[PDB]
RNA sequence: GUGAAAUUUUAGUACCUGUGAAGAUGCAGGUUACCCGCGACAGGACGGAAAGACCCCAUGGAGCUUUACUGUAGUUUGAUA
RNA sequence: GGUGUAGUGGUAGGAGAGCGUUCUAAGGGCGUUGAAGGUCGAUCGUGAGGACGGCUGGAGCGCUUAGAAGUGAGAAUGCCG
RNA sequence: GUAGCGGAGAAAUUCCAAACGAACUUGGAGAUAGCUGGUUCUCUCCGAAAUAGCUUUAGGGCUAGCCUCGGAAUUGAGAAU
RNA sequence: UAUAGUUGAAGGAUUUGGAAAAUUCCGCUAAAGAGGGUGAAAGCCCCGUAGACGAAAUGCUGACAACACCUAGGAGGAUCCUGAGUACGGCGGAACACGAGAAAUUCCGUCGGAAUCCGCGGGGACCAUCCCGCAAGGCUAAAUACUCCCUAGUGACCGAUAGUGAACCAGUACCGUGAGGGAAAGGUGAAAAGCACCCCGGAAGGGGAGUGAAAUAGAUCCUGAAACCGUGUGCCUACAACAAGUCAAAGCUCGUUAAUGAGUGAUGGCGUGCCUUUUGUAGAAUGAACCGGCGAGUUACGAUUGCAUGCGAGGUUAAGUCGAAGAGACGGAGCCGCAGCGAAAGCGAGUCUGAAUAGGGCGAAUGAGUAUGUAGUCGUAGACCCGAAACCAUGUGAUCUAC
């Protein structure tokens, strides 16, 4: 049959123009009294997926 | 070519690897699998993306956004592609098709200015960026959103 | 060529001979034979379909 | 006269003191010993028979208990036909 | 092709290049003046392996090039004899 | 006559066709087993690990570290004094 | 048209054999050189094949006839009709890819319960407006699924431990109260010509003589491997502690694919099997009595990388139609690539964040793809093979034992 994509990954990630994967950040929904303003200012910028994670993740997102 | 002297091209066919056929081949006795463990069993292995029991990377990250149901995507053609027409032609979505430049015009054509025109066209399309229309009109033609 | 049926009947059954019409030549028919004996009409008909 | 069995890597299958997966017929150094059998005894072959029943594990089972969780047959109480 | 210099222990495992079995196609062959199979020999190659000769045997079988695989056995307290 | 989510028991977890903490037969069924056993031809080149971190994790796994094959790249980035 | 049938071309000698279809000469035939048989391998010997011909009877399928049924316009808009315990709503369940969810639509149980063309339902809670339909009555060919069976065939499918469990009198013998479980076992020769007669012996069996190309092809019958059991001989062996060989070597006995020959060997040096699992094994850790046969990374569909070929800012068709189960043309729905950024509205070689033209993120700046073949890895499927204790759902047992 066909391969099924991981529907939980696809709701969380997107594919950039040179093949990468933009991602959101953690520690960004919850107790902000436990973290500094500089931390929460700098946890507002997106990032990318690392090479260890991508090697193990590649096949689940092949089609979207 | 005669049917008793066939020859494929070099590098085009390779043979095959058969495991479990003696020691000297390199892959007898456990056939490349190492010693014991879950990965040495028939049907052994863990599912894709599994990580032991640590919280998997998809599950620490938050979800994001929504899909719009009235989304419009267009079928860009820039400015070099309008150089393969004669000086004065009235380029249009049916003359773009039937040259194969555009097949599958999603929600209509949109012209983009990247980067250089020298013709006398009169372009008919659904959308124009500010610089596409501009450079089209410098070279000496006209636009009409339709 | 075509409904040249007397010729195809006469040429059957000879153990060195194969018979094909001009709308039904394959790659394997031409490679296996040593020669081709084609009529003038059939030659133009082949030139019409290979174009 | 008739006629099995469990067992079995191949065997021309000694003793002492050592060595060694730390208790050797088979390895070292010695000592003893012509070749082939019969009737008897059980010290060794970690002798044979039974992939330890003792102990721990498998995110194994199964039977049992209850003020462990989540359900339910049965019994009861109200509304409505 | 010559000549120099350097190298060539190996378990898990990666990479290369080959030997042999059965069947398909095309080509060129052998066979009751004896095919396959079996048995013996003091033969050849760096290895898997290849020939030639005797005896047995009685009807089928090699070689070249390409293709396809139920394609190689010493072990599972394996299964049948 | 009483039948397996069952029967029968002067009560022993006792009996229900030489086996009963839940009979026998067929099917789901090639149940599942992070465990144990086995896995069949040849030569040439290279050649590990037995560690860190996280883990209902500790004889399993994942990412890094350590092996092998193919490419790219400015160098004079590597080593030993 | 199905179910019996008819007719159907063309060869002799020679060599080797028991026997030719083989060999060598010289001929003929083909709308027939597909296949099977015959004392070995046949276009021309036999049965057939290509082509031509045929049905008393019964059954099927067409066509055209009869017979049976069914089917008309224009206008009016006074009034009447158009499927009721129904649509629908509350409560409880289920079906829709949709797990109560913001839950439209379709069903079942229970209770409540419309309107009538100035009407009624739907467009995914709900309302208004616009648009598309007219429930609560019935039937209907084809295009799609399957093969116990009959005819005609096909296979880079098996060839007697294979292929059906079963090539043979097989669901048999055998096992169980029963439901149920379930095998082993093919081959003389061209032709039985299958050994008349004699001799030893109760017979079995054997030796002659005969058959036959061959009997060491004699019915336990083609070939006839190994384990295992014997008989005969060249060389060694009764003072010797041996994982059984290997290297050195006198004597004896032979004489080969002819070369730095072959068998045996007193005596001397050295030397703790094979496999598995282990930090580590001769292991007193694990497996194997021996010999033979069988017995384990495969395929389908997807995803990715390397190699190879054709086209190249492009590449390529799917289902389907004609065609020999084929090649070999039609078919452009569709798929990938050619532009990105942003949650989105959107903007575009740029865009998002931002008051910012600042800075920063991701992109551009000549920067190659696509179809197919082949090999390496992965996913879904039993997915390299063998191995539980158990769980569930139909059925069969009180001829033993308990009451």
Judge contact between B93 and B125, C-beta under 8 A: yes
Residues in chain A: 64
- Among B125, B72, B140, which residue's Cα sits nearest to residue B95? B125
Contact yes or no for A56 and B49 at CB 8 A: yes
Q: How far apart are CA A40 and CA A32, in angstroms?
A: 8
Distance separating alpha carbons of residues A42 and A63, to the nearest angstrom = 32
Q: Helix, strand, or coil here: A32? A: helix
Number of H helices, E strands in chain B: 3, 4
Q: Cis peptide leading into B115, omega within 30 of 0?
A: yes
- Residues near B101 by Cβ (< 8 Å), separated by ≥ 6? B77, B81
Handedness of CA B42, B43, B48, B52 (dihedral sign): negative
Q: Of all nucleotides in the shown strands, which has a C1' nearest the CA of B15?
A: G375
> Which residues of chain C have a CB within 8 Å of the CB of B2?
31
Domain that holds residue B127: 75-145
Strand, helix or coil for residue B58: helix
Report yes or no: B74 and B110 within 8 Å, Cβ to Cβ: yes
**3-state secondary structure at position A33:** helix
Q: Residue B62 and residue A24: Cα distance in Å, rounded?
A: 7
User: Per the CB < 8 Å rule, is A6 touching B64?
Assistant: no
What CATH number is attached to the domain comprising B124?
3.100.10.10
Cα distance between residue A61 and residue A6, in whole Å = 7
Q: With beta carbons under 8 A apart, name residues in chain B contacting A12.
A: 58, 61-64
Enclosing domain of residue A18: 1-64
Distance B19 CA to G298 C1' (A): 12
Q: Residue written as tokens 């056929």?
A: B21
Q: Which residues contact B121 (CB under 8 A, 6 or more apart)?
A: B82, B85, B88, B89, B90, B91, B136, B139, B141
Phi, psi values for residue B103, rounded to 5°: -115, 150
Please tell me what DSSP assigns to residue B81: G
Query: Which chain C residue has its CA at the smallest distance from B1's CA?
Result: C31
* B1 has a chain C CB within 8 A of its CB: yes
What resolution in angstroms does the PDB record give? Answer: 2.9
């Amino acid at each position: 049959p066909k391969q099924k994509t991981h529907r939980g990954l696809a709701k969380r990630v997107k594919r950039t123009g040179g093949g990468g994967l933009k991602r959101g950040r953690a520690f960004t929904s919850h107790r902000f009294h436990g973290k500094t303003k500089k931390q929460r200012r700098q946890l507002r910028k997106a990032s990318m997926v690392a090479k260890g994670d991508y090697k193990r993740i590649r096949q689940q997102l092949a089609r979207m | 070519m005669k049917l008793h002297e066939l020859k494929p091209a070099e590098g085009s066919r390779q043979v095959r690897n058969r495991v479990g056929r003696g020691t000297s081949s390199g892959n007898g006795k456990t056939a490349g699998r190492g010693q014991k463990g879950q990965k040495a069993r028939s049907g052994g292995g863990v599912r894709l993306g599994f990580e032991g029991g640590q919280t998997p990377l998809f599950r620490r990250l938050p979800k994001r956004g929504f899909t719009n149901i009235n989304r419009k995507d267009y079928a860009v053609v820039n400015l070099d592609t309008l150089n393969r027409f004669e000086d004065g032609t009235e380029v249009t979505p049916v003359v773009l098709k039937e040259a194969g430049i555009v097949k599958n015009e999603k929600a209509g054509i949109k012209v983009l200015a990247d980067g250089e025109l020298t013709k006398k066209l009169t372009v008919k399309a659904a959308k124009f960026s500010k610089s596409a229309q501009e450079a089209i009109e410098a070279a000496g033609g006209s636009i009409e959103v339709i | 060529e075509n409904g040249n049926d007397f010729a195809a009947l006469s040429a059957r059954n000879l153990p060195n001979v194969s018979v094909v019409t001009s709308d039904n030549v394959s790659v394997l028919d031409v490679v296996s034979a040593n020669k081709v004996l084609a009529t003038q009409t059939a030659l133009t008909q082949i030139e019409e379909v290979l174009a």
